[PDB]
Write a protein that binds this ligand. Sequence first.
Ligand SMILES: Nc1ncnc2c1ncn2[C@@H]1O[C@H](COP(=O)(O)OP(=O)(O)OP(=O)(O)O)[C@@H](O)[C@H]1O
Ligand SMILES: Nc1ncnc2c1ncn2[C@@H]1O[C@H](COP(=O)(O)OP(=O)(O)OP(=O)(O)O)[C@@H](O)[C@H]1O
Length: 1127
Amino acid sequence: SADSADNLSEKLEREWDRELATSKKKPKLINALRRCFFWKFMFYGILLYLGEVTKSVQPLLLGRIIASYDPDNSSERSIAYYLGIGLCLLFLVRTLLIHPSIFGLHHIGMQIRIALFSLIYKKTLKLSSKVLDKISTGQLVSLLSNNLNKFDEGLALAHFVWIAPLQVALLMGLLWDMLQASAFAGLAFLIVMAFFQAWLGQMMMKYRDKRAGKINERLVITSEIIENIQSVKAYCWEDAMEKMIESLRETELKLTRKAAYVRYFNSSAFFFSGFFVVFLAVVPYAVTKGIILRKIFTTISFCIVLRMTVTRQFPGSVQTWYDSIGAINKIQDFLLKEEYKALEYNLTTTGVEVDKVTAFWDEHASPVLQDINFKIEKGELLAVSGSTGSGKTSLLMLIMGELEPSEGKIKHSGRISFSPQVSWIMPGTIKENIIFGVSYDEYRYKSVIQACQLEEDILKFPDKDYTVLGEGGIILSGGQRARISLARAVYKDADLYLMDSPFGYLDIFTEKEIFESCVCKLMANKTRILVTSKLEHLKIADKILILHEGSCYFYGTFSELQGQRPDFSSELMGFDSFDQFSAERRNSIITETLRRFSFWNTYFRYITIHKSLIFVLILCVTIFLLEVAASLVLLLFLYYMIYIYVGIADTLLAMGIFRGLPLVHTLITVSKTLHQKMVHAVLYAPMSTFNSLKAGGILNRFSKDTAILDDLLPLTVFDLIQLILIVIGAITVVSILQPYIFLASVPVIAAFIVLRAYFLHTSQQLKQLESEARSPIFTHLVTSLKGLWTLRAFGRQPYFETLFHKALNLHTANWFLYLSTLRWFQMRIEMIFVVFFSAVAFISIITTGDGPGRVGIILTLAMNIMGTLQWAVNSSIDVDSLMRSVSRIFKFIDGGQMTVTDLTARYTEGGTAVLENISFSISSGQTVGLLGRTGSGKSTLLFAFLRLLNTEGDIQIDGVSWNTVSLQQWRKAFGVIPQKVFIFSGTFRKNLDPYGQWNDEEIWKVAEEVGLKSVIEQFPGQLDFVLVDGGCVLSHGHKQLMCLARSVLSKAKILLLDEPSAHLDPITSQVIRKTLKHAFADCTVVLSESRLEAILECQRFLVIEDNKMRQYESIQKLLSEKSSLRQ
Ligand SMILES: Nc1ncnc2c1ncn2[C@@H]1O[C@H](COP(=O)(O)OP(=O)(O)OP(=O)(O)O)[C@@H](O)[C@H]1O
Ligand SMILES: Nc1ncnc2c1ncn2[C@@H]1O[C@H](COP(=O)(O)OP(=O)(O)OP(=O)(O)O)[C@@H](O)[C@H]1O
């Protein structure tokens, strides 16, 4: 196998294609994979087997070593000495064999994951356009992310399904004194515990899935709040929002608490089983014959090995193996989906023809285009219009071959250049997008960018042609993005050009210039098809096509339309000034014209009250499980003293469990408190200070830190308690029996501490790389999916495959490094442990072990100490991560005449002053407003009034200086409607009144007053209607009216309007102006405008530039100076 994506793909594709081609009904992905996998997998598998079997040998060697100190036979020092050497070698050898093999398995898992990803990517780019709208988008994201961190770890246990029965059979077969079947007592106990654990694990999954659903809801409201803190503060909404968070948090905790108990009992159950396999193991020796230390010590070590292989190594592989298979099956179902069918290029014609085409998207379709017919000569212009939905753009999909005809033929000449309705951002170099995938030629480039009028904006870009367009399109306005899409489509040399919604939401002036510049001259003699709403274009076009309800309304000469459907023409012409109508209005006019011219309970309470009932219930479970094991013991079918001793053991264990329950209670309480305090601290935060994170780390830390406290503190703590108790016992006993062991062990622990610290520093830093390399694989994917229509249209598939592979290679390189440092670390750790082991074995062997039982116990304690120690290493790693998270959390918590005198503002106490020494007066009830350049800090006056900025000077409102008024009332006076309006998701009643202070009747009265009564009536449920996704169903004008309704209910006196005109068409802007003037007849209205025509209705003006201002008492004084200063 290969170490790179290109090679891994070739191999997978060859086997997959060969089997898929060998069409034995249902070819399978799993077979293509086993043919790659098997010849490496099996070798690491056998090596691990050979490694693990060592554990089944080591106890035998100790039994003989122990025997050498017996009074029997002779004190053969030399034998004890050499056998001791052999034992320490067994530790060393398995260490040296096992770790390399585990590493190799992870290497394999990685290689397979990469091959699978490249296969999927290649497939998504070849999918049929029909199934494209049936496959949920969330499924492709999860198809790749769901097993991202699972598949490659899972192979580590895969060969255990195979190993487990070999070691179980051996350990069973090695039992000494086998017929007195202590074997069944042992196995019956372990078997019952294993099923118990499986059941409990299933309950854990139930809780995880339900909780996950609630988490997503909490996170959505959380990000909504975080990105709009200024509106929450401006509204003085505050704690109502805090309460919304509280109810979501409370819901999650109820589920979490139950999940926590599942985890608690799982861990104590594990402990319980440890005790009993050892305890049951000595029941034979108490029962008749008596004790032989030689055999007892041997017996216990074997019992320990069975516990672990039986309860943990086996079922882990079973669960892993099964889930992995299910993941593969899902991938296969995805791969086996209908393809995009390639278009066959030919030299049949020069024009475009359509012969009786009838077609539809899917089965059960009524949107069948009927009897479509064309004959277009080379170089002719076709203009198409029609009702929205009557195949306005679906026709283009037929032309390009995305949609097949059910009947008829489509003939075309050569290659097609296509520009879609919705621009594809293509993050990257702007010149490169214009000429993407083609050679640069300045002759053509200049001609196209000049003709398309790009120079007007692109020459203002800081790196010109090399200005990079980043994510979000922060460089370009929607009309500019459209302009680039045209330039790209034009730059490409094609025989046929298809222009989807070419008007581009552009100003009519440029729209005309582009049509003549491009449609007529730049595109001269090309065959063209334009989608259009302008009658002038139809007049210009050689052929006119109008569609309605899936069929042709009219096809022919412009004058033929007028001669054959004159009433249609006359009605449209009544709106003679069509160039003055936006596309939306042009669309409504044709839609209407065209359709018009149609042509238990008592005790439950006591159980909560009496903790003594809780104790009994704990004991009852313990009794039950032992009795079940007895049922299996009774297999022998085909005493009072034993009964007493086992009863005693159960009682003691039950009390031990009962004692620790308050810890679970405490853990849930603590994370609840921390979540609540962080939220409070963020809401009542200073402004400017939060700009250190700018919502990035705020959302990410808020979300992630809470999640880790809840899943790990309640888990890692219990493992630590058990591990701690074990080591205390182990050290205490050897220290007493032989003080030289202590002397020897002190430097051993020191060695581990130092290595650990070094390791964690570096590995914690490397971990950052997974996220850095991982994020872009998804950004790449999404971009490719949105661009699918053009990726095929222009033949760019291999370009993108190349980019995808480079991203994968980056990711795997970092992933691999992380894995490698971890493995090295673990190997070093194990070798240190191996060395102290050898030394300890010899301390015992060497000293005067004349009371041999003491020799035996030191040796078995040391031999079996390694299991616990491996857990301890990993637990220490988790602890350090938890403490780092705790610190990150802790870091956050441990006047009618408005009179403004000498006002100054900054974005921080350092920084820059955005406004200095401004003085300004507003007469009571006076309509006033502001003029200034875009980016002159207009919003910083509004924020200075809202007290969101570092500020100086004296503002007198409601008769007093701001200096004597707290933020809530100071802000209360100001009813502000920002350009970016915040919409709270949820029921309209709450969106408008989050406190429940207004009555429904009152709410309706205001809805009527502000013109939203018809809007709320239209939405089902009215006040009970739930508004979603930021008001995705509302006009932004409506959002402004909602804000208005809030302002009037709130009884604000100062009304602040942030350029409503920035987005609202005058046809409605005047309606809201009338509405608010009546609503605010007794109030003072302050407007920030972009144009003189709007500012014109004001009596006093504030004109701001360069952190200074000129006050005018009349528009004429403003105009006289503005003319002199019109620059
Ligand atoms: N691949 C598809 N499968 C099924 N239905 C589709 C598919 N693509 C679009 N549609 C729908 O069927 C019709 C397709 O026609 P077309 O896309 O030409 O309409 P349009 O008038 O261009 O759409 P609009 O102007 O509303 O964006 C639309 O009314 C749309 O709702
Ligand atoms: N709190 C802030 N910290 C840092 N920079 C800011 C802050 N507030 C605004 N800015 C920036 O400084 C200027 C502030 O002016 P303002 O926010 O009034 O601009 P605008 O003309 O309203 O811009 P837009 O049209 O994008 O809304 C802008 O050009 C913006 O880029």
